[PDB]
Ligand binder design. Structure first.
Ligand SMILES: Nc1ncnc2c1ncn2[C@@H]1O[C@H](COP(=O)(O)OP(=O)(O)OP(=O)(O)O)[C@@H](O)[C@H]1O
Ligand SMILES: Nc1ncnc2c1ncn2[C@@H]1O[C@H](COP(=O)(O)OP(=O)(O)OP(=O)(O)O)[C@@H](O)[C@H]1O
Ligand SMILES: Nc1ncnc2c1ncn2[C@@H]1O[C@H](COP(=O)(O)OP(=O)(O)O)[C@@H](O)[C@H]1O
Lengths: 48, 303, 375, 70
């Protein structure tokens, strides 16, 4: 599980909380269109 | 004309040599953005809070996983824009900063500003011309006619509270003034700043007012402040005190050190004597307005 | 000839055009290649000297460690009590570092946007002189105190009704040096973590000892003050812990020299007598509601930016004013101003003030009126 | 009532070793540091000398009730 924190301009580069583990910015993947990301939601996110 | 011909030949040779050197330099830049992208395309960026800027030029950071760190080489980011207290992305393996994050605001703080922009108009309000008029001149005129205040020269009135019996109607005026302004509008629930993670409500207060500071044309409204505005008291072995911190930081950040005229607090309640005198003091909120009972014609207008 | 010289100059300029870009490229390449070995990132603190090559350190995360040093780090200079940098993989000391800044303290170190002077304040000038007696005189002229043979006072506190000139003094006093002034809201200190409030105020006092002239300031101390508790909730534990520890940090086994604590709260009726103690807090200063001449001078100060025809008896507004704050008169000025801003009046007529007094009067008919004297 | 200066005077006038700590540093950022912080100081008191250890503000560390869920 994960927790969305903040969006970003142009290329996705969203910010993700785990639960308390780390608070950091990645682009996740590309198999879904980047319109399902809203703050207050939980994605299934890997560690690497 | 032998000297001129020799000068022309030297000019051509120097131009060719400069072209070759510029091509070699461009190839060097190609290897440069190659290495920069291969150290930059590691999209995992563990972020960190910068701590200090040493000189013996060097820097200190504190990461997300609670570890203090010192790095001699600052990295890709130039340090003149860097000041301590910020937060920046950091490579996982190298523990080097690479980019700069804009800000950091809480998700609950994010989910407060109006997205739907409710549609209401003044004709829905009956028998309340005076209150609506004085709210409009106390809010929109500081938003739209700044030079009108400045030409005479005064600070704008800061802080409005409306009160009255709950059936009286005031909320609707919040929706109407939301509909009328083309500015950023933030809304708070009453006890929304009540968390048992200690001082989390303080973080909520400072985060909300920092976001309010970010949008320079903006107004801040809180409904039902009597949850937090309950008067402080002296007692032993019992007594809530988290709401004391929340109310104190609320009052201070709206009025106290670093006074600011960019956001206007709008404050609703249904009773007044619960409210602590500190918030209603004189200038921590300015305009106290009562809702009268709909006397005889306002009822017909509303129905 | 001339065209050849022009071509040579243009080619040289084109070659030197990328010279700054080439310098940036070399700097970035060197930065990346050094960043391959600038990974030596982790920070610890040394405990004791086992040998000249055997040392014990503690990480800022957790466990302690046994670590040595390279042969050019001045091992005698590594006293117990200093911060140092470590490697991860070999876990070796590379460099001693000076004391940290802890950027929370930096956030209110020199951020002061105010520049108000003592002319903007008024009506309480003898209290300003009383505060100056402890905040200015011993810092510049300490010699008379050892001539009379007593220590200058360690700190003072302010109290009174709300909004009655405290932080004017505090944002007025804050506009004097701007380098020895630290100032906190007594609310940012608390945090959801375990005990970090004590840590941050410890390093705050350490920073105060770092620069020997420093003035600390905590306002609205009620949030940390309280009286005491017999463990109703659980947050009372660590906030009272922070309190107790603050007390022992201000007068425990230390000469807190050239550091002055000036306080501010709305109501001292909810403070610990341990915090109220004359040994702890020396002088208590009350600010009352402004007097008639004080109200006169205050509104005259707030009569700075005014445009109108001057036929105004200030005495009438003064006489109608009673029990009025040090701030609501400025609201009265503003509210007569908004009377002027309706019906298109660039000036202000003389009458708009008095109704404004009436306008503020009923607005403070809903007050609590609690004196809340200190015990 | 002079509870600190008595400790100050006996620490100034002692011949043997003495040690003190502010009575709140036994809580730390991480887990279990405090038990080390008391065990090592007791061990140093044992090792060093016929010394005297001073502890203050026990109310910071000794309460009546507890909530083993926070
Ligand atoms: N004696 C005074 N002279 C001039 N202005 C005053 C005086 N007392 C209060 N004010 C006004 O009060 C307003 C608030 O000032 P400030 O923030 O310093 O408050 P305070 O008196 O320290 O109290 P509190 O923090 O409880 O509001 C300012 O606009 C200031 O002009
Ligand atoms: N015999 C004495 N009685 C009272 N105060 C004394 C005495 N001798 C010195 N003092 C000084 O008078 C003040 C009262 O004592 P002090 O402030 O040290 O409180 P304390 O009891 O020592 O500390 P605490 O109560 O926090 O444990 C201090 O300045 C103290 O140094
Ligand atoms: N013209 C009007 N004047 C007064 N009240 C109205 C009018 N039109 C609708 N109302 C009622 O007033 C309510 C507005 O909410 P309000 O009572 O001000 O919220 P709160 O009680 O939380 O302050 C609406 O629910 C509506 O039923």
């Amino acid at each position: 599980c994960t927790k969305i924190i903040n969006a970003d301009s142009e290329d996705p580069k969203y910010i993700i909380n785990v639960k308390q583990f780390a608070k950091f910015v990645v682009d996740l993947s590309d198999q879904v269109a980047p319109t399902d990301i809203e703050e207050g939601m939980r994605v299934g996110v890997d560690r690497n | 004309r032998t000297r001129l011909l020799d000068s022309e030949i030297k000019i051509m040779k120097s131009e060719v040599l400069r072209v070759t050197h510029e091509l070699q330099a461009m190839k060097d830049k190609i290897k440069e953005n190659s290495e920069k992208i291969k150290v930059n395309k590691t999209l995992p960026y563990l972020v960190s809070n910068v701590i200090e800027l040493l000189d013996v030029k060097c820097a200190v950071i504190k990461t997300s996983t609670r570890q203090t760190y010192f790095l001699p080489v600052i990295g890709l980011v130039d340090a003149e824009k860097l000041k301590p207290g910020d937060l920046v992305g950091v490579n996982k393996d190298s523990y080097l900063i690479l980019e700069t994050l804009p800000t950091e605001y809480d998700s609950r703080v994010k989910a407060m500003e109006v997205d739907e922009r409710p549609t209401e108009q003044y004709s829905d309000i009956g028998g309340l011309d005076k209150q609506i008029q004085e709210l409009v001149e106390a809010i929109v005129l500081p938003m739209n006619h700044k030079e009108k205040f400045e030409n005479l020269g005064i600070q704008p009135p800061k802080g409005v509270l409306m009160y009255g019996p709950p059936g009286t109607g005031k909320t609707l005026l919040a929706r109407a003034c939301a509909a009328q302004t083309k500015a950023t509008f933030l809304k708070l629930a009453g006890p929304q700043l009540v968390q048992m993670f200690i001082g989390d409500g303080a973080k909520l207060v400072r985060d909300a007012f920092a976001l309010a500071k970010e949008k320079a044309p903006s107004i801040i409204f809180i409904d039902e402040l009597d949850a937090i505005g309950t008067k402080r008291f002296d007692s032993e072995k019992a007594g809530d005190r988290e709401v004391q911190r929340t109310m104190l930081e609320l009052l201070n950040q709206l009025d106290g050190f670093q006074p600011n005229t960019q956001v206007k607090v709008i404050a609703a309640t249904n009773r007044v004597d619960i409210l602590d005198p500190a918030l209603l003091r004189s200038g921590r909120l300015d305009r106290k307005i009562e809702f009268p009972m709909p006397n005889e014609e306002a009822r017909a207008r509303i129905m | 000839k001339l065209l050849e010289h022009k071509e040579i100059d243009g080619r040289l300029k084109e070659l030197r055009e990328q010279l700054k870009e080439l310098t940036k490229q070399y700097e970035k390449s060197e930065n990346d290649l050094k960043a391959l070995q600038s990974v030596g990132q982790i920070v610890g603190e040394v405990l004791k000297q086992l040998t000249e090559e055997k040392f014990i350190v503690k990480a800022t995360n957790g466990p302690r460690y046994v670590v040595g040093c390279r042969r050019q780090l001045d091992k005698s200079k590594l006293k117990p009590g200093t911060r140092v940098a470590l490697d991860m993989t070999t876990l070796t000391i590379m460099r001693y570092l000076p004391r940290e800044v802890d950027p929370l303290v930096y956030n209110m170190s020199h951020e002061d946007p105010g520049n108000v002077s003592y002319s903007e304040i008024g009506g309480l000038s003898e209290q300003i002189r009383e505060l100056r007696e402890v905040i200015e005189l011993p810092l510049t002229n300490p010699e008379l105190f050892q001539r009379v043979g007593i220590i200058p006072p360690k700190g003072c506190l302010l109290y009174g009704p709300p909004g009655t000139g405290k932080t004017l003094l505090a944002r007025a006093v804050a506009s004097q040096l701007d380098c020895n002034f630290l100032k906190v809201v007594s609310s940012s200190i608390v945090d959801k973590y375990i005990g970090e409030s004590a840590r941050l105020i410890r390093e705050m006092f350490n920073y105060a000892r770092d620069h020997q002239p420093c003035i600390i300031f905590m306002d609205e101390i009620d949030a940390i003050g309280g009286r005491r508790f017999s463990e109703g909730t659980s947050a009372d534990r660590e906030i009272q812990r922070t309190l107790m520890e603050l007390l022992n940090q201000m007068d425990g086994f230390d000469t807190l020299h050239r550091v002055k604590m000036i306080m501010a709260t709305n109501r001292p009726d909810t403070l610990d007598p341990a915090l109220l103690r004359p040994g702890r807090l020396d002088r208590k200063i009350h600010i009352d509601l402004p007097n008639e001449q004080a109200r006169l001078d205050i509104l005259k100060i707030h009569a700075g930016p005014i445009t109108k025809h001057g036929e105004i008896d200030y005495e009438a507004i003064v006489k109608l004013s009673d029990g009025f704050n040090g701030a609501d008169l400025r609201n009265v000025c503003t509210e007569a101003g908004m009377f002027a801003i309706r019906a298109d009046h660039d000036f202000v007529v003389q009458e708009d003030f008095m109704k404004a007094v009436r306008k503020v009067a009923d607005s403070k008919k809903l007050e609590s009126k609690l004196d809340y004297k200190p015990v | 009532c002079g509870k600190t200066m008595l400790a100050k005077a006996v620490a100034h006038h002692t011949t043997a070793a003495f040690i003190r700590v502010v009575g709140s540093e036994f809580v730390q950022k991480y887990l279990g540091e405090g038990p080390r912080m008391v065990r090592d100081v007791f061990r140093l008191a044992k090792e060093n000398a016929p010394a005297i250890i001073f502890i203050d503000e026990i109310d910071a560390i000794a309460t009546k009730r507890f909530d083993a869920q926070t």
